[PDB]
Amino acid sequence: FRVSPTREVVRFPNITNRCPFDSIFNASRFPSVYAWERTKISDCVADYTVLYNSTLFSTFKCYGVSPSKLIDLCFTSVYADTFLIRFSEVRQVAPGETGVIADYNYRLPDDFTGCVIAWNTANQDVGSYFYRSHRSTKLKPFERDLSSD
Amino acid sequence: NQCVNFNFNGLKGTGVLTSSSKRFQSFQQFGRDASDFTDSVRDPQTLEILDITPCSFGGVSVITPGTNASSEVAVLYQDVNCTDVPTAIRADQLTPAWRVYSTGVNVFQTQAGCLIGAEHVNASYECDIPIGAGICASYHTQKSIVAYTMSLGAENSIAYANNSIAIPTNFSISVTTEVMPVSMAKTSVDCT
Amino acid sequence: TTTSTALGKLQDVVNQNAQALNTLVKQLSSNFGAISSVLNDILSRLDPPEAEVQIDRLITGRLQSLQTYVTQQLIRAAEIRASANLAATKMSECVLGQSKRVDFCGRGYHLMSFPQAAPHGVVFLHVTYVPSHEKNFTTAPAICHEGKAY
Amino acid sequence: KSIVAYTMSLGAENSIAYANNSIAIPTNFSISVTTEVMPVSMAKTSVDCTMYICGDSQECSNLLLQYGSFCTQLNRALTGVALEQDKNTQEVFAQVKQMYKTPAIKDFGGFNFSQILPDPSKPTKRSFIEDLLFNKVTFMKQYGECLGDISARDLICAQKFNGLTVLPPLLTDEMIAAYTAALVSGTATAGWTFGAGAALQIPFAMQMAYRFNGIGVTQNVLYENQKQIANQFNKAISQIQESLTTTSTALGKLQDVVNQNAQALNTLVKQLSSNFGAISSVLNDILSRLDPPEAEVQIDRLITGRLQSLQTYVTQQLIRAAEIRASANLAATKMSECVLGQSKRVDFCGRGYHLMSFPQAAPHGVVFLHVTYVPSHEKNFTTAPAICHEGKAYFPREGVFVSNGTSWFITQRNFYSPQIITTDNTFVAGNCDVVIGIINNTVY
Amino acid sequence: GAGAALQIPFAMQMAYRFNGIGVTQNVLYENQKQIANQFNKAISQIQESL
Numbered sequence A: 001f002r003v004s005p006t007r008e009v010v011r012f013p014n015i016t017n018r019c020p021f022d023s024i025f026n027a028s029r030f031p032s033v034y035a036w037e038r039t040k041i042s043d044c045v046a047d048y049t050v051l052y053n054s055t056l057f058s059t060f061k062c063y064g065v066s067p068s069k070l071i072d073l074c075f076t077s078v079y080a081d082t083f084l085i086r087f088s089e090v091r092q093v094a095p096g097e098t099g100v101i102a103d104y105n106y107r108l109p110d111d112f113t114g115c116v117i118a119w120n121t122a123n124q125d126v127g128s129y130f131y132r133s134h135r136s137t138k139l140k141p142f143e144r145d146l147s148s149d
Numbered sequence B: 001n002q003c004v005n006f007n008f009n010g011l012k013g014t015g016v017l018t019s020s021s022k023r024f025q026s027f028q029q030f031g032r033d034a035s036d037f038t039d040s041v042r043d044p045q046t047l048e049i050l051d052i053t054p055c056s057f058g059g060v061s062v063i064t065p066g067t068n069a070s071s072e073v074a075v076l077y078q079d080v081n082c083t084d085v086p087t088a089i090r091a092d093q094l095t096p097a098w099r100v101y102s103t104g105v106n107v108f109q110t111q112a113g114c115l116i117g118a119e120h121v122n123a124s125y126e127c128d129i130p131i132g133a134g135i136c137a138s139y140h141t142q143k144s145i146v147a148y149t150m151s152l153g154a155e156n157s158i159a160y161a162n163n164s165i166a167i168p169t170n171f172s173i174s175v176t177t178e179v180m181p182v183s184m185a186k187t188s189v190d191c192t
Numbered sequence C: 001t002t003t004s005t006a007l008g009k010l011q012d013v014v015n016q017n018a019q020a021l022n023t024l025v026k027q028l029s030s031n032f033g034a035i036s037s038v039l040n041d042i043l044s045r046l047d048p049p050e051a052e053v054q055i056d057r058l059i060t061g062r063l064q065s066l067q068t069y070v071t072q073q074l075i076r077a078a079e080i081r082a083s084a085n086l087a088a089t090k091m092s093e094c095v096l097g098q099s100k101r102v103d104f105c106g107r108g109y110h111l112m113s114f115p116q117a118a119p120h121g122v123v124f125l126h127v128t129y130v131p132s133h134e135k136n137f138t139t140a141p142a143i144c145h146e147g148k149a150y
Numbered sequence D: 001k002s003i004v005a006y007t008m009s010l011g012a013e014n015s016i017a018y019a020n021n022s023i024a025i026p027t028n029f030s031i032s033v034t035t036e037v038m039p040v041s042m043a044k045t046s047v048d049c050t051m052y053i054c055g056d057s058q059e060c061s062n063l064l065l066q067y068g069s070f071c072t073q074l075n076r077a078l079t080g081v082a083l084e085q086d087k088n089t090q091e092v093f094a095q096v097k098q099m100y101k102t103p104a105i106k107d108f109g110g111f112n113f114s115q116i117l118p119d120p121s122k123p124t125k126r127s128f129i130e131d132l133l134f135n136k137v138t139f140m141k142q143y144g145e146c147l148g149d150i151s152a153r154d155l156i157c158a159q160k161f162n163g164l165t166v167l168p169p170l171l172t173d174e175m176i177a178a179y180t181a182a183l184v185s186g187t188a189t190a191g192w193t194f195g196a197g198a199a200l201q202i203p204f205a206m207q208m209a210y211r212f213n214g215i216g217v218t219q220n221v222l223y224e225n226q227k228q229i230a231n232q233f234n235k236a237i238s239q240i241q242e243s244l245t246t247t248s249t250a251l252g253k254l255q256d257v258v259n260q261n262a263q264a265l266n267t268l269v270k271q272l273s274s275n276f277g278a279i280s281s282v283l284n285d286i287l288s289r290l291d292p293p294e295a296e297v298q299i300d301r302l303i304t305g306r307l308q309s310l311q312t313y314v315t316q317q318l319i320r321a322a323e324i325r326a327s328a329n330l331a332a333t334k335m336s337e338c339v340l341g342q343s344k345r346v347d348f349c350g351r352g353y354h355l356m357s358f359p360q361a362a363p364h365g366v367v368f369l370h371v372t373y374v375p376s377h378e379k380n381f382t383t384a385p386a387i388c389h390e391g392k393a394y395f396p397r398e399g400v401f402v403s404n405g406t407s408w409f410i411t412q413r414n415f416y417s418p419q420i421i422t423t424d425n426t427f428v429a430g431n432c433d434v435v436i437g438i439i440n441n442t443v444y
Numbered sequence E: 001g002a003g004a005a006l007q008i009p010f011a012m013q014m015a016y017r018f019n020g021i022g023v024t025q026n027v028l029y030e031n032q033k034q035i036a037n038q039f040n041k042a043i044s045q046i047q048e049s050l
């Protein structure tokens, strides 16, 4: 009962340049859900505060880690997947879901660790986009069909 | 050398020292122990390895003669040497009342550890409060804690000769008691 | 009448029979990973599908306390039985007869014993023969008189 | 070589030649010394609850406050065990309270007591047999030694960095050696008198004559064969200290006790690598990635289960301490009955007819050396239940009637020594016609 | 039980066992038939009790 700590020591690496957020979140265009793309992120300083006065996210759900703890954490294998769907299909982007998106276009693994971010982009995307309606079987996690006819 | 909470990409509050020539494969920061523990963290920008040790190590014991008799105590620090007590219990971060039991003149070294708060006595008595390794303590005379060494029994000698015998000339009748337990209480439990 | 410590074993048995039922009572005020240790507080503010998973967290743990108490009771009875067996053997051998076993019935040469009833036990009064006043003498293993040893 | 399977053998096949007028009487004897190893006490352990569960974690330490009756309960349960181990040693070894001095001369009528008594030349205060016994069985590590050696991670340092420690015994080995030396010197210079009062000296040849008389052999046999008996005892004290140098399995029980004291603290350390239904077995990983309302749920799952491991260890320790106490009680009874006196119970103090016993100190136990009487060389004789002379039957007072072929004699049961049948050797009860198998002879 | 087996005609053994409990051995030799009948009767009426 006699001893207690009194001060804190913190040691972090030498990385100093900010992470590209406007290159990913504010890209010129996004691919279709059946042709989703993967981007590697490395040598970054990830601070989400810089998007506070410019963005508005309808969905922000994290798995295996809690929000308001990402400030004091260091990650190693960071990857980003970007695609474009309808507003009502965001609920299918979750581990263990069903629907036309969850088994034929994009499937998450069961032991998934990461976050899912979505926001509405009306008056920005006007073109025609495609998705898989049916298939002979279901997709494996983190797999892509990328074919037609 | 202080109790500190460290944040080398992970939170834990211990005492940090300088590590020896530990083997590191230039890839890991902490490694893993047998009990799924992370020990001897590496400084993330340099190559220097540090030491993670609990800053409350070992067990301590308190010897008291009873609160209705006195209020002074004696502290036994197990498996440490004397003059290593203030480093072991981090005496500089404690209250001044706790600091008077880390050094002084009533310091005695036993095989059970360093005992502070009782001055050694060269006499031998029966065991009152057992401490360990043949050392017992009591409350003797103005009174104090004595922390003596126990006595096995009275010293005797037998006069042996090859033509000699001792034969009793009288006797006595003695009645002595013996107390043995037989039964205990009969308890019943209702689950719901 | 003056010495008040000769019956310490029976008092220890009585004190160990107590304070184990008291710790079983005081262990009821434990959450065991629930929002409260009172069942009424859980049942008055939660719907049954939620409250079932909180009642289960108390049930598992009150059962643990009961199992621990039963195990310690069995372990204590295991040595109480051995003490009772030794007491029965001493009653059969020191009271109903004279024993030649060394230090089985008192210290010295055993003459007889008397039993006395005690709360949750028995007290034996051993009567023994103790030689007191020795004296030096000169001895010899044998004596021969007419060429024949005696 | 190959693995073979067979039916076990119960023992050697034997047959006894039985006749209704026939007896077998030994004509020679031998003195045998045998050992017996009994455990007395085990190691005393202490457990710190918070240090084992969540040492150096204030969040779990605050969470480990609804509990605490369990921790004090198991702490007092472990404290009750540690107090019993000193009581076992006190009840076994501290039977007498007179520290009798070791005699200067270790020879008592041709019997050599040098190997079971301390010698003043050697620096250690224990006998040669105790020195041999203390090497047949294989902690007190300090802080600074544990930190200075992480290249070799031993099990003792991992136990002490959690809340597991071992307390030293109250009585050191020197005190046990002094108790055994006092007991041996008392039983060598005073026999059995000091166990029921003050010690009375006896020249140890008359004491051996009394002990021979206790087993049904007349005391003149010892005085006739004293040199051979002393030579046999000295040869039997020898070739048992060389059996403690080559053979390395006589102390198996104490080694089993030591090995069971270990590897239960080791499994308690290795049981910390368990999730118990949580996302990780490390508290720091849970606390560094989850907010406290979610982290409390995962911390509670580790707490409930580390408590279970501690409870299981305490229960097994109590169960082991019960049988340790039973062995200690048996050892105390054996010390009170085989060493402080002569026992008539069959096979209680060695095999044979018990004469005397000597205790020797062993780590966490005691070793008894039982000296016994073994008859060796039997011979065939023709016997009769009674002899009638003038119409009146005669019966032996102590012994049996035997015939060597021509004449009739009376001899003791356990040693062949024929004597003339006189009226002092027999008593008169009845007539010839009431005894089946009576014979005709003369009584001098 | 304390060495090699030595034979004895079992009447002298019973006389020795009678002497062990404080009864002189001539009682056994006087009442051998009655004692044997009592032993045979006691070995009986205990198997039928089983």
Ligand SMILES: *[C@@H]1O[C@H](CO)[C@@H](O[C@@H]2O[C@H](CO)[C@@H](O)[C@H](O)[C@H]2NC(C)=O)[C@H](O)[C@H]1NC(C)=O
Residues within 6 Å of the ligand: A053, A054
């Ligand atoms: C959101 O806040 C950022 C951070 O202050 C603003 O970016 C700065 O804007 C000022 C003009 O107001 C420029 O001079 C700075 O160079 C900008 N700094 C950086 C680091 O880019 C940003 O303008 C704000 N956005 C809105 C819409 O108000």
Ligand SMILES: *[C@@H]1O[C@H](CO)[C@@H](O[C@@H]2O[C@H](CO)[C@@H](O)[C@H](O)[C@H]2NC(C)=O)[C@H](O)[C@H]1NC(C)=O
Residues within 6 Å of the ligand: A136, A137, A138, A139, A140
């Ligand atoms: C991966 O490709 C294989 C073919 O290489 C697919 O297997 C086909 O599965 C369908 C299911 O209806 C069958 O009709 C085809 O006959 C299969 N083809 C062959 C050559 O066996 C498989 O379904 C693909 N997808 C996955 C997720 O494994």
Ligand SMILES: *[C@@H]1O[C@H](CO)[C@@H](O[C@@H]2O[C@H](CO)[C@@H](O)[C@H](O)[C@H]2NC(C)=O)[C@H](O)[C@H]1NC(C)=O
Residues within 6 Å of the ligand: B169, B170, B171
């Ligand atoms: C043995 O001791 C007893 C006492 O324990 C002696 O009895 C005493 O004898 C004296 C005279 O010699 C009397 O004055 C006392 O009253 C006696 N005491 C008691 C309690 O009766 C006894 O004489 C001693 N015997 C020998 C042989 O010395």
Ligand SMILES: *[C@@H]1O[C@H](CO)[C@@H](O[C@@H]2O[C@H](CO)[C@@H](O)[C@H](O)[C@H]2NC(C)=O)[C@H](O)[C@H]1NC(C)=O
Residues within 6 Å of the ligand: B157, B158, B159, B166, C134, C135, C136
């Ligand atoms: C029997 O004789 C022995 C030997 O003389 C006595 O032992 C002596 O006791 C005196 C008591 O003052 C001591 O000073 C001596 O040192 C002892 N001698 C030895 C050799 O140890 C013994 O007391 C006598 N016993 C009785 C009952 O009178």
Ligand SMILES: *[C@@H]1O[C@H](CO)[C@@H](O[C@@H]2O[C@H](CO)[C@@H](O)[C@H](O)[C@H]2NC(C)=O)[C@H](O)[C@H]1NC(C)=O
Residues within 6 Å of the ligand: D015, D016, D017, D018, D024, D378, D379, D380
């Ligand atoms: C006493 O005599 C009996 C026979 O009366 C001996 O027993 C015989 O021992 C021999 C040894 O070679 C065997 O071949 C016989 O079969 C035995 N006979 C019976 C009936 O079992 C016995 O050995 C003799 N004892 C001694 C000590 O000499």
Ligand SMILES: *[C@@H]1O[C@H](CO)[C@@H](O[C@@H]2O[C@H](CO)[C@@H](O)[C@H](O)[C@H]2NC(C)=O)[C@H](O)[C@H]1NC(C)=O
Residues within 6 Å of the ligand: D027, D028, D029, D228
């Ligand atoms: C019992 O047997 C022993 C061992 O054979 C006998 O001791 C031997 O006695 C002879 C003389 O009779 C000596 O030459 C031998 O040296 C002795 N042997 C040993 C090992 O000491 C002994 O005599 C026998 N005892 C009886 C009573 O017959």
Ligand SMILES: *[C@@H]1O[C@H](CO)[C@@H](O[C@@H]2O[C@H](CO)[C@@H](O)[C@H](O)[C@H]2NC(C)=O)[C@H](O)[C@H]1NC(C)=O
Residues within 6 Å of the ligand: D106, D107, D112, D113, D114, D115
């Ligand atoms: C008792 O036995 C011991 C051990 O054998 C004997 O001590 C040895 O005696 C011989 C002969 O004098 C010496 O060479 C050895 O050095 C002694 N060994 C030790 C360890 O002391 C002792 O003499 C015997 N006692 C007697 C015969 O009275």
Ligand SMILES: *[C@@H]1O[C@H](CO)[C@@H](O)[C@H](O)[C@H]1NC(C)=O
Residues within 6 Å of the ligand: A013, A014, A016, B045, B046
């Ligand atoms: C980079 O790391 C070095 C290691 O020696 C340290 O001295 C320096 O301060 C670091 N630089 C920054 C900008 O943190």
Ligand SMILES: *[C@@H]1O[C@H](CO)[C@@H](O)[C@H](O)[C@H]1NC(C)=O
Residues within 6 Å of the ligand: A022, A026, A054, A124
């Ligand atoms: C983001 O993209 C929009 C068009 O979608 C553009 O108007 C804007 O300038 C870009 N940058 C920022 C910082 O908002």
Ligand SMILES: *[C@@H]1O[C@H](CO)[C@@H](O)[C@H](O)[C@H]1NC(C)=O
Residues within 6 Å of the ligand: B081, D142, D143, D144, D145
């Ligand atoms: C403690 O002191 C002893 C001598 O009394 C020494 O041998 C031992 O190494 C010391 N232990 C330490 C410094 O840890």
Ligand SMILES: *[C@@H]1O[C@H](CO)[C@@H](O)[C@H](O)[C@H]1NC(C)=O
Residues within 6 Å of the ligand: B122
């Ligand atoms: C007490 O014993 C110690 C150790 O032998 C010795 O140095 C000291 O002088 C003794 N003191 C007295 C007062 O006898």
Ligand SMILES: *[C@@H]1O[C@H](CO)[C@@H](O)[C@H](O)[C@H]1NC(C)=O
Residues within 6 Å of the ligand: D404, D405, D406, D407
């Ligand atoms: C029996 O002993 C007697 C007395 O010693 C002796 O005379 C006789 O010859 C012995 N008989 C035999 C057969 O040895």
Ligand SMILES: *[C@@H]1O[C@H](CO)[C@@H](O)[C@H](O)[C@H]1NC(C)=O
Residues within 6 Å of the ligand: D020, D021, D436, D437
């Ligand atoms: C011993 O048995 C024989 C037959 O083997 C018999 O003739 C004899 O009478 C018996 N003797 C006794 C005393 O029973």
Ligand SMILES: *[C@@H]1O[C@H](CO)[C@@H](O)[C@H](O)[C@H]1NC(C)=O
Residues within 6 Å of the ligand: D439, D440
């Ligand atoms: C013993 O002597 C008596 C009396 O002379 C005689 O009747 C009997 O037959 C004898 N018995 C034996 C076995 O010789």
